Design a protein around this ligand. Structure first.
Ligand SMILES: Nc1ncnc2c1ncn2[C@@H]1O[C@H](COP(=O)(O)OP(=O)(O)OP(=O)(O)O)[C@@H](O)[C@H]1O
Ligand SMILES: Nc1ncnc2c1ncn2[C@@H]1O[C@H](COP(=O)(O)OP(=O)(O)OP(=O)(O)O)[C@@H](O)[C@H]1O
Ligand SMILES: Nc1ccc(COC(=O)NCCCC[C@H](N)C(=O)O)cn1
Ligand SMILES: Nc1ccc(COC(=O)NCCCC[C@H](N)C(=O)O)cn1
Ligand SMILES: [K+]
Ligand SMILES: [K+]
Ligand SMILES: [K+]
Ligand SMILES: [K+]
Ligand SMILES: [K+]
Ligand SMILES: [K+]
Ligand SMILES: [Mg+2]
Ligand SMILES: [Mg+2]
Ligand SMILES: [Mg+2]
Ligand SMILES: [Mg+2]
Ligand SMILES: [Mg+2]
Ligand SMILES: [Mg+2]
Lengths: 264, 264
């Protein structure tokens, strides 16, 4: 017998990349569902008995240790930010992707504006070079795709002062992704906010956009020294590490725990 | 000479609890400001040279290790949640404290609704008892006070099944606060959502509200077993640990780093 779209969708929810199960071999839906339910219950029971850490939380902690140990200050800045930061970043009325809150606020779509404010302020107190990073939630309205979430998690690290060359930026990216065990290439791209970017690609998947300053936008943020920085999506890193078909498996969710369906 | 309100406000920004400086001793504002600026620059330089971890991030990691090691599963759930969860939690049209997003969403004011969904779903797969926790941002519109932030960080841990007694709840709270070195007492209180609470107090400062289920609200969330849980504000824990006068010192902010003014 043949499987309906609803039946295939249910089996796909329960299927994991490590499995080797053909959904349309002729085995009835009831037995495919029962087999996958048993595998997923066993997987969740093993996590509960032996590990207990959330993939997104554990990755944030691993990344934090990497950057702290390399001399970058750990930042935790507001998620709810002034709407004025949007226009000030050069997001001309992308601007359609912004989640507005009340009338003067929004959910941050990126970490860069708050990190620019920290670079400017810390430059008055700390020795050259200034090295900082932040990991946390960012928000964009997106067309539902396999690589986009509306609520995702960004890492942005950046440096201002000496050492702010393309070669040093590439070297940090290389050390970071070598630490995570992720192969990549660098390709040029461009964006409306920062201009030319160095995009870090794993196949066709964009892991990061990186920027070598100065850029004209600097003046609007009081930045007046060379700088480099890069933004990475943590859910995309997890998608690569675990071979997930859809980025939803990696997201903050009530529907998946460490890539395992919670509808069991 | 006498200090103006603006001058006193500036010195208070730069003052830290460890300092022993009288603002109205007769010393001129210029010298008090210069002394405090030097102390704060030295403090920030020491953090940058030797530690580099953000207080809120470090506390979240310490708390995460405590609960993971005691058998609780680490959850990371959505911050942007359906507005329908508000009415379903019994927040009758407090409801005025909700940050609305678009027309059907809001910023979560607490972690409990997402954790209730996880308890229900995990009970179908995991052995008794189910023990989970989450740490992350929550949002409430508040009257500007010394103990309230509009963007704050909650820990909520909870357990469902066996062991869900008042004595076990108090024992977990005691072990947790003993681990952090924070003295407390338990006092009864009540709230409109959960009914009677056990409030964990440090002096007059409410560190937590805790609940022993079942409660009538359970039916609306599909919860049908005994449960216990408690919610704690991380910024309030930091305020106690570091003797901050105002909770702003502990918050996500561009204005303070580990309680040190960034306006230097
Ligand atoms: N909606 C999203 N969901 C998940 N990750 C995202 C999303 N948007 C951006 N990212 C991640 O954040 C990084 C930096 O943000 P950036 O502004 O460069 O994204 P982007 O160029 O718009 O990405 P894309 O072209 O895939 O939409 C991206 O390289 C990606 O890893
Ligand atoms: N606006 C806020 N800013 C900082 N922490 C908060 C805030 N609201 C709640 N908390 C923290 O979260 C815990 C659990 O939330 P709960 O709903 O019990 O707060 P609450 O009873 O409204 O607190 P309060 O009476 O001080 O307003 C509180 O005990 C407190 O530690
Ligand atoms: N003027 C300044 C100065 C310094 C910074 C520090 O921030 C950075 O390192 N940016 C790096 C690119 C991240 C990609 C981004 N998420 C985007 O939407 O393309 C910001 N602005
Ligand atoms: N029906 C159910 C069942 C289980 C849970 C799990 O969540 C909890 O442990 N709550 C503990 C109290 C936290 C205080 C809260 N921030 C407030 O606003 O008073 C929730 N609901
Ligand atoms: K598979
Ligand atoms: K998606
Ligand atoms: K999400
Ligand atoms: K003082
Ligand atoms: K406040
Ligand atoms: K804040
Ligand atoms: Mg995009
Ligand atoms: Mg792109
Ligand atoms: Mg990009
Ligand atoms: Mg309150
Ligand atoms: Mg209260
Ligand atoms: Mg309370």
């Amino acid at each position: 017998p043949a499987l309906t779209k609803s039946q295939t969708d249910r089996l796909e929810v329960l299927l994991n990349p490590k499995d080797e199960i053909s959904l349309n071999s002729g085995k009835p839906f009831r037995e495919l569902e029962s087999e996958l339910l048993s595998r997923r219950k066993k997987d969740l029971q093993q996590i509960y008995a032996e590990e207990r850490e959330n993939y997104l939380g554990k990755l944030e902690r691993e990344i934090t240790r990497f950057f702290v140990d390399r001399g970058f200050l750990e930042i935790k800045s507001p998620i709810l930010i002034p709407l004025e930061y949007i226009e000030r970043m050069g997001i001309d009325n992308l601007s359609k992707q912004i989640f507005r809150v009340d009338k003067n606020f929004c959910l941050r779509p990126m970490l860069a504006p708050n990190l620019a404010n920290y670079l400017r302020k810390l430059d008055r107190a700390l020795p050259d070079p200034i090295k900082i990073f932040e990991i946390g939630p960012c928000y964009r309205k997106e067309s539902d795709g396999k690589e986009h979430l509306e609520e995702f998690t960004m890492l942005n690290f950046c440096q201002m002062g000496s050492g702010c060359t393309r070669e040093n930026l590439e070297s940090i990216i290389t050390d970071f992704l070598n630490h995570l065990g992720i192969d990549f290439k660098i390709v040029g791209d461009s964006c409306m906010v920062f201009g030319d970017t160095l995009d870090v690609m794993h196949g066709d998947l964009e892991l990061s956009s990186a920027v070598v300053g100065p850029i004209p936008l600097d003046r609007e943020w009081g930045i007046d020294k060379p700088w480099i920085g890069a933004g990475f999506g943590l859910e995309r890193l997890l998608k690569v590490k675990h071979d997930f078909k859809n980025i939803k498996r990696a997201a903050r969710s009530g529907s998946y725990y460490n890539g395992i369906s919670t509808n069991l």
